[PDB]
């Protein structure tokens, strides 16, 4: 699977960055696991079967083969490259794909 995410996004004044993360092709799966990693630290992770309930700074919705990610609480020091990881967990085969990363610019 090929994961696509935008090269660069600008966070809002209020520290909220939103961007899509999409995968292709659309293999049969019942459960997709999305992780946001910062370059490696784990920002948030969730399984879709509206997500990221274990992670107050992340939210997201999943349709078709595309997650609309929102990362909030960002400050200027949080500027950096945020990788999207997508897993097609079950039924097998398992598939994993890494995006090339979204550079998020945050201004205080």
């Amino acid at each position: 699977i090929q994961v696509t995410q935008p090269s660069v996004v600008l966070a809002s004044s209020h520290g909220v960055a939103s961007f899509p993360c999409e995968y292709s092709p659309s293999h049969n799966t019942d459960e997709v696991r999305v992780t946001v990693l910062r370059q490696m630290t784990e920002v948030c992770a969730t399984t879709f079967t509206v997500g990221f309930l274990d992670y107050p700074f992340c939210s997201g919705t999943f349709n078709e083969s595309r997650v609309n990610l929102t990362i909030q609480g960002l400050r200027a020091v949080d500027t950096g490259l945020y990788l999207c990881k997508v897993e097609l967990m079950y039924p097998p085969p398992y598939f994993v794909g890494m995006g090339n990363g979204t550079q998020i610019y945050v201004i205080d």
């Epitope: 699977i1 090929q2 994961v3 292709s24 459960e31 992780t35 990693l37 490696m40 784990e42 990881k85 967990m89 079950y90 097998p92 085969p93 398992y94 598939f95 994993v96 794909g97 890494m98």
Partner: antibody, heavy 118, light 109 residues
Amino acid sequence: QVQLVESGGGVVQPGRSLRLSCAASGFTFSKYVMHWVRQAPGKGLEWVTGISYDGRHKYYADSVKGRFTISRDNSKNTLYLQMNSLRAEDTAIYYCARTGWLGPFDYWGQGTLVTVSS
Amino acid sequence: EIVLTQSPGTLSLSPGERATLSCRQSQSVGWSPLAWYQQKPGQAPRLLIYGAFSRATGIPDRFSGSGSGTDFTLTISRLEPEDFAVYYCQQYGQSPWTFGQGTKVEIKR
């Protein structure tokens, strides 16, 4: 420091069962996919089985599906391989391996040897 | 299911020379989940490179990787005596996780 320590190997007769254990230390075990990989004498690496983060999803090589079962206990940070209906060709060094978050098998134990012989 | 074929079976070289090891994958998969491992006798495999070109932790700079689609290479720029070993490639983008058959890097005489 990341360490993985396998145990349980030994000599077993064809048809019987053996359970291997892998003790994980030095990382948050529940945040990684874990695997067993084996290497028969003089041969290369063969993935056997892997298990998702919370244990819900188990993946098997065709060669072992139906005979081997993988499980994990995230409270005591241990991975298991339940081997049944063992055969001569299952003789190998059995390694426990962690999947890095970016996908490769970034740490491996030293392995435990399983000999299946009459 | 992804099959990996490594070449040559054996690379024969001297310290200070360059090693180039090839790994060909059955299909392209939209990115490069291609890893390389070193293995010495009696020891477990060690991750060297992942994502085709990223070095793993503590791996010397003389190890590099390149490639995309179906064709990948591991380069040891200037071989050291500690590098004579067997090298495996692996695809980790989908189950079953699969490996190449290995390339032995031996001393040439």
